[PDB]
Amino acid sequence: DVQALVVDNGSGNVKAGVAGDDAPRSVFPSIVGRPKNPDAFVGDEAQTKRGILTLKYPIEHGIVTNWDDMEKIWHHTFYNELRAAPEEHPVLLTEAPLNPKANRERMTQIMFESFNVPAMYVAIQAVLSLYSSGRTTGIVLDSGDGVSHTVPIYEGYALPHAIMRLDLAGRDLTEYLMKILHERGYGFSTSAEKEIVRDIKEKLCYIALNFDEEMKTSEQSSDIEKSYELPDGNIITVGNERFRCPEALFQPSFLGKEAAGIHTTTFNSIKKCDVDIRKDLYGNIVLSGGTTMYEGIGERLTRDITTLAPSTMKIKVVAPPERKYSVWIGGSILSSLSTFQQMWITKEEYDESGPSIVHRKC
Amino acid sequence: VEHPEFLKAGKEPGLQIWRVEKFDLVPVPPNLYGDFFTGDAYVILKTVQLNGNLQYDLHYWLGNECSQDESGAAAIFTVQLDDYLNGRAVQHREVQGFESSTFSGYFKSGLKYKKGGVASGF
Ligand SMILES: Nc1ncnc2c1ncn2[C@@H]1O[C@H](COP(=O)(O)OP(=O)(O)OP(=O)(O)O)[C@@H](O)[C@H]1O
Ligand SMILES: [Ca+2]
Ligand SMILES: [Ca+2]
Ligand SMILES: [Ca+2]
Ligand SMILES: [Cl-]
């Protein structure tokens, strides 16, 4: 009798909770702060003490790059957020598509040797999202704070030769909104101001169905303009920046990037899969992650992919309402199933076989 | 695996229907085959006998009011049953009211729906 813990580690936020819940009970920023002048603070606490700490993100574009700080994030997760003994719960952890083997092994070693977990399992974020949508076949477009991926999945398993990565995601859009607000005379530049602008972005932005036409209509009146109350009580007004900002998802050149937009990338991903399964991918384009939350995204993606795809294909973009946490929810469901007991790696297996066990078992 | 229902799966030609109930795969009473609760999700295995061998089609059926734990579990259990059958099953997603003719044709009396279902596991 033992409930698994579910931990979804993101570039921007950690989502954590207990298997069988419909949503993470703990969500906090993936930030570790250490004294500028000397051990560590994590999440919201770190941001409140930005004045005395150097703040770092241990996960970049979905990949762990600072293992010492990542262990601080996990210790914070177990001890300050969940108040769970890691040595007494199976843990399901998530990983990015194309996560390097060495990183998976290091995560496994830390769990079994630093946190002494009795059992663990590593799942691919996009696959958990597809399951959470009630599908075994589809292509997931997962866009978070640090990275976007398109992940074609057939009968339960990702097709690795067709996975695309696009480093453009929510933080780039936050930074781009900070940039274009200078047109109106705003200077948002500090770390704290960026958190403000992130919230403005989430509250006020939307994706235009046709960008060029939206630019023309927005110029004909002030109906585009919407306001936002800043912490200090001042009110900011935002106009066509509302849809110019997330337009960068479709036109990365707005950011000075040569990357293809998310519509082109989803199309290219589907094409890498053999012609006999593409119908089920085009018909099951599933959105995942916080940066897919913009109003208008499904209608825009449908129009743009329909234009790219063969005219005999049926395009269907699925936008689940809880898709901001669909990775976590998928992990919660998976780890609740009667059958999950035989999917995990036990510590005794790890002790006998070492961290490489993770590949044969996950 | 060790799940008792996996061990029964696909042994003989016929039709096997399970309902997702609180994150588990529970056999549907045979008397109720063909009548699906709109509040629930189900997994269906159709086994056909060929030139010696057996062929497998796995369908997961999603009622219009089933909860996300139920539809998600139906999808995952479908993958796991396929794996247990060495990947030889063909998987089919079946949505209430838009089911494939192959799925409908499993039921001599036709597909029927009923109100209600088992409570979500959330
Ligand atoms: N309603 C919203 N509209 C637009 N963007 C949003 C909304 N809600 C959240 N976001 C954005 O989604 C991002 C966080 O999403 P998510 O939690 O999926 O990412 P993550 O897992 O931390 O990062 P990654 O998956 O890139 O490693 C942030 O950029 C945030 O501003
Ligand atoms: Ca993520
Ligand atoms: Ca139900
Ligand atoms: Ca199969
Ligand atoms: Cl076309």
Residue numbers in the entry:
A (entry chain A): 5 to 42, 52 to 375
B (entry chain G): 3 to 52, 54 to 125
Give excerpts from the publication.
Actin is the constituent protein of microfilaments with essential roles in central processes in the cell, including transport, cell division, and motility. Outliers of this functional consensus are actins of the phylum Apicomplexa, including Plasmodium spp. and Toxoplasma gondii—both notorious human pathogens. With less than 80% sequence identity to their canonical counterparts, actins of these parasites are among the most evolutionarily diverged eukaryotic actins while still retaining most of the core features. Here, we analyze phosphate release rates and high-resolution structures of wild-type and mutant Plasmodium actins in different nucleotide states, bridging the gap between structure and function in understanding the polymerization mechanism and the instability of the parasite microfilaments.
Gly115 in PfActI is located in the P loop of SD1 and is Thr, Ser, or Ala in other reference actins. We previously generated a mutant G115A that did not rescue long filament formation in the absence of jasplakinolide but showed slightly longer filaments than the wild type in its presence. We crystallized the mutant using the same conditions as the wild-type PfActI with either Ca2+ or Mg2+ to compare these structures. Unlike the wild type, the C terminus of G115A is more ordered, with interpretable electron density up to Cys375 in the Ca2+ and up to His372 in the Mg2+ structure. The G115A mutation straightens α3 and moves the P loop slightly away from the C terminus. This in turn favors a cation-π interaction between Lys114 and His372 (3.7 Å) and a hydrogen bond between Glu118 and His372 (2.8 Å). In the wild type, the position of Lys114 does not allow both interactions to take place simultaneously, which is the likely reason for the disordered C terminus. Trp357 and Phe353 are in a double conformation in both structures, the former facilitating a recently identified cation binding site. The conformations 1a and 1b of the A loop are evident in these structures, but conformation 2a is not visible in the Mg2+ structure.
